[PDB]
Design a protein around this ligand. Structure first.
Ligand code: DGT
Ligand code: CA
Ligand code: CA
Ligand code: CA
Ligand code: CA
Ligand code: CA
Length: 902
DNA sequence: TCGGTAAGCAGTCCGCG
DNA sequence: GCGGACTGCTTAC
């Protein structure tokens, strides 16, 4: 097989590399890598190395990496560009793996671990590590085993061994319900003392050294706690055995508010699953507890135990260990679904970077572009310092707040990357500038043609047309990968809808789910067999289809994120290829493109309708337009349609056969106008929205920019079994809105769009009457909590104190003295409730850690003093009043001549 | 939050005769 | 009471 790296490090003048050799074995080597860097040289000197602008360079070979680094410094001292890859491990990887890397994941040791630490005096701080580590569960991907290290004797109590028999049993048998599929994979090791446990853990680690190290909050808790505890008991050298090269750094993580400390383990790639989840999931969650996220992702119940976690080991050690094991497994289950580790490996090996660098799109793209240029013997420029400067972004149309009955939306495929490719925007393709007219003049095609030679953006920039820039070349490659995975995602989605349809008529039989590839549209043969399947098999197929859709979503959305990040990186001062001329060339072209096509679509539809100056495009944001289709429907007449699906078909056909050709024509003209390299503005129909045929549903409404709701029957060619609400920006979509309120507001919107005003009034009346019964957590607001200390003046709110911070301060005063009280962690999320006047907390609100029940000693008082009226008006009524006034509807029945008469 | 801009709403402070 | 000048937070792209 072809070799591939696992990890790479620079330690002084040595590269330390762990890799898989040509026989599939894991090896480690120390390499005295001699780096090269570059200086400009005279043209009269013969060379094969050129910078990106075509200027000749001489290669400088250094005796070692420190010499190379010193040379960079002296070149700065002289005032001359020091060209080349200054991150020497990236150059090493480029030299050592000069081909597209094919990796074998089965050879990569992925370790998932979690530790437990009993602490009677609050949160066990990783920097202090003053409490014994009393449990470690460490799952190894190569052995496919859970290695359980269990401390039986502690200063906080001596316990009996954990029982695998009880662990397996149902919670109704007094057991812990450790999943049957992992029971046989547990290797249980009890220890009579902590020193023995840790020494054995280190010997184990030495034997089975993680390449990828993950788990939940491992980077901020488990890793620094283990490191520091071993350091405290044994000394630093023993703690450094967590690094295969025995090198670590206590590294400070800084942002804006403060700083925290993590431990860098050289020769390990830490991908904390919480960080993977935050980067790759495209969710914003009210809580990031593993319980909370496992419930969201897997629909598994919260791990139930009695009393505080600080007493769980002594009171129920059996459950303590079982929950430690289950916790490790939950992360594995989340990964089986989301496939973020797979994603990270894919992107890391593609870029030829340390796997953990996938968190940095700037590092990722720097390596991609470097490797690409190096193939042509081209030489990358030195990174430079730039002051942070603001620059313009997208255009967003101001909508008229209103109901909108029939709506067809259209959206440009991968806009910013497509602009880059179309215009040929790259550091080395800049050809010059032209004299800019107001943007409006380009939109309306009255400005002079920018260039007859170069490819242009309406920000004034011109680009070469003779050859693709490196940025267009490399962005195209990832765009193509993205396109493939999106295809699989959409097929799985369409396939899921077939199954949902079939589930209306389940067959009464015992059978099996079909063995199919959900990434490809079901054949007629499959469709016929599905129509004969039982509900049990159908539901299993649906679950599998949706799992396939999730896998495709992960693969596509994050490749989209990477390519959009390249467009964004051009406007980040830390990017080697930072250039506001290029960043703005992209955003300004986008502004023109949207407004250009708004004009074209309005012109086309006014033509087919035989009107003048009518506004068909009601809205647009960045790269999308929303077209009113009322007149199109009305041209055939509602009564002519058999059912909802009939007008949906008609609009779909109209969009594809009439509107899309007109859209393409408009964009080809714009391409010629800007003299672009290649027409890539592809705007396809996205949504077809409207009320159910013959109903009083309003179909949709806008309240303002980035705030709307649509009843969608077809999205990107997925025809839904049941209509789906597309809601953007409204409170139902915000993590800050209480859970039960999101749900209620969603149902109000559903009723408005599908059923009408009367249905809405019926539901409002009911919610208003019953809501005080809702669980306090479900009606709590949520907020991130930054700068708590900043607004704290002797335990009370300082000037300008935010509402949620006030709640935290109220909480802090209420828990002064309570030993079992959780602390609010700076920068994390909190639940927030309003409090009625004259409450014993002495303020108008209280806040506590999100994803948790409020501590028992104040819970009863909070419940008693919760201000339901304020809660209702602020989270439910105010937003609903916003929705209904926009839609010209009333959520309460107004008086009529029938009232109180006949 | 260690890792692009536009723009919405909550809330504080305080004017607005 | 609402709206502007702010801070804070969160979402649409
Ligand atoms: N830097 C950055 N830009 C974004 C992000 N989301 C959207 N944009 C910008 C770049 C996109 O091309 C443009 C339009 O956003 P869309 O959500 O429609 O995505 P896009 O057109 O790229 O892909 P698509 O084919 O429609 O799924 O807005 C983002 O998360 N980060
Ligand atoms: Ca735990
Ligand atoms: Ca788009
Ligand atoms: Ca059937
Ligand atoms: Ca869009
Ligand atoms: Ca098309």
């Amino acid at each position: 097989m072809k070799e591939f790296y696992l990890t790479v490090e620079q330690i002084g003048d040595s590269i330390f590399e762990r890799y898989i050799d040509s026989n599939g074995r894991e090896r480690t080597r120390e390499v005295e890598y001699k780096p090269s860097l570059f200086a400009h040289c005279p043209e009269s000197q013969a060379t094969k190395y050129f910078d990106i602008y075509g200027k000749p360079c001489t290669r400088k070979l250094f005796a070692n990496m420190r010499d190379a680094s010193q040379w960079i410094k002296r070149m700065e001292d002289i005032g001359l560009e020091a060209l080349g890859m200054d991150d020497f491990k990236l150059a090493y990887l480029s030299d050592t793996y000069n081909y597209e890397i094919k990796y074998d994941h089965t050879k990569i040791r992925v370790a998932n671990f979690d530790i437990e630490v009993t602490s009677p005096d609050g949160f066990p701080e990783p920097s202090q590590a003053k409490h014994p580590i009393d449990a470690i569960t460490h799952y190894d991907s190569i052995d496919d085993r859970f290695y359980v290290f269990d401390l039986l004797n502690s200063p906080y109590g001596n316990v009996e061994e954990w029982s695998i028999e009880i662990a397996a049993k149902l919670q109704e048998q007094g057991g812990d319900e450790v999943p049957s599929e992992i029971i046989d994979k547990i290797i249980y090791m009890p220890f009579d003392n902590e020193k023995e446990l840790l020494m054995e853990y280190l010997n184990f680690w030495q034997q089975k050294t993680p390449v990828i190290l993950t788990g939940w909050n491992v980077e901020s808790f488990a890793i620094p706690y283990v490191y520091n505890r071993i350091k405290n008991i044994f000394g630093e050298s023993t703690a450094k055995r967590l690094s295969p090269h025995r090198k670590t750094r206590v590294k400070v993580i800084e942002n804006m508010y403060g700083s925290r400390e993590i431990i860098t383990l050289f020769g390990i790639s830490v991908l904390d699953y919480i960080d993977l989840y935050k980067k790759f999931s495209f969710t914003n969650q009210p809580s990031y507890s593993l319980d909370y996220i496992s419930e969201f992702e897997l629909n598994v119940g919260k791990l139930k135990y009695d009393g505080p976690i600080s007493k769980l080991r002594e009171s129920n050690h059996q459950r303590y260990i079982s929950y430690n094991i289950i916790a490790v497994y939950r992360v594995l289950q989340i990964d089986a679904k989301r496939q973020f580790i797979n994603l990270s490996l894919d992107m890391g090996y593609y870029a030829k970077i340390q796997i953990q660098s996938v968190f940095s799109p700037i590092k990722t793209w720097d390596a991609i572009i470097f490797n690409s240029l190096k193939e042509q013997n081209k030489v990358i420029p030195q990174g430079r310092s730039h002051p942070v400067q603001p620059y313009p972004g997208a255009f967003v149309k101001e909508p008229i707040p209103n109901r909108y009955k029939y709506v067809m939306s259209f959206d440009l495929t991968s806009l910013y990357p497509s602009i880059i490719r179309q215009v040929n925007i790259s550091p080395e393709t800049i050809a010059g500038t032209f004299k800019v007219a107001p943007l409006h003049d380009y939109i309306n095609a009255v400005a002079e043609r920018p260039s007859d030679v170069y490819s242009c953006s309406p920000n004034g920039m011109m680009y070469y047309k003779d050859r693709d820039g490196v940025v267009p070349t490399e962005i195209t490659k990832v765009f193509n990968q993205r396109k493939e995975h999106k295809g699989y995602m959409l097929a799985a989605q369409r396939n899921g809808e077939i199954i949902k349809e079939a589930l209306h008529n389940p067959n009464l039989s015992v059978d099996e789910p079909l063995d199919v590839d959900y990434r490809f549209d079901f054949s007629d043969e499959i469709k016929e067999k599905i129509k004969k399947l039982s509900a049990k098999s159908l539901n299993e197929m649906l679950f599998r289809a949706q799992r396939t859709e999730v896998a495709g979503m992960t693969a596509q959305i994050n490749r989209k994120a990477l390519i959009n990040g390249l467009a964004g990186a051009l406007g980040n001062v830390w990017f080697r290829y930072y250039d506001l001329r290029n960043a703005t060339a992209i955003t300004t072209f986008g502004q023109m493109a949207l407004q250009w096509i708004e004009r074209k679509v309005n012109e086309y539809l006014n033509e087919v309708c035989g009107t003048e100056g009518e506004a068909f495009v009601l809205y647009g944001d960045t790269d999308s337009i929303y077209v009113s289709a009322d007149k199109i429907i009305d041209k055939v007449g509602e009564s002519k349609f058999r059912d909802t699906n009939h007008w949906v078909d008609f609009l779909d056909k109209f969009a594809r056969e009439r509107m899309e050709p007109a859209i393409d024509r408009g964009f080809r003209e714009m391409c010629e106008y800007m003299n672009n390299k290649q027409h890539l503005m592809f705007m396809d129909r996205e949504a077809i929205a409207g009320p159910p045929l013959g109903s009083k549903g309003i179909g949709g409404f806008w309240t303002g920019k980035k705030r709307y709701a649509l009843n969608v029957w077809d999205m990107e060619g997925t025809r839904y079994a049941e209509p789906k609400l597309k809601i953007m920006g409204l409170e139902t979509q915000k993590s800050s809105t209480p859970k039960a309120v999101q749900k209620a507001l969603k149902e109000c919107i559903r009723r408005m769009l599908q059923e009408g005003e009367e249905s809405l009034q019926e539901y409002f009346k009911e919610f208003e009457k019953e809501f005080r019964q809702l669980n306090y957590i479900s009606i709590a607001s949520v907020s991130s909590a930054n700068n708590i200390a900043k607004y704290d003046v002797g335990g009370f709110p300082g000037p300008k104190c935010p509402f949620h911070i006030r709640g935290i301060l109220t909480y802090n005063r209420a828990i002064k003295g309570n030993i079992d009280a959780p602390q609010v962690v700076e920068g994390e999320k909190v639940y927030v409730l309003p409090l009625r006047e004259g409450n014993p907390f002495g303020d108008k609100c209280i806040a506590w850690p999100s994803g948790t029940e409020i501590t028992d000693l104040i819970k009863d008082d909070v419940l008693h003093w919760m201000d339901y009226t304020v809660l209702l008006e602020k989270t439910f009524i105010k937003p609903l009043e916003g929705f209904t006034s926009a839609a010209k509807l009333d959520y309460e029945k107004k008086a009529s001549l029938f009232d109180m008469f006949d």
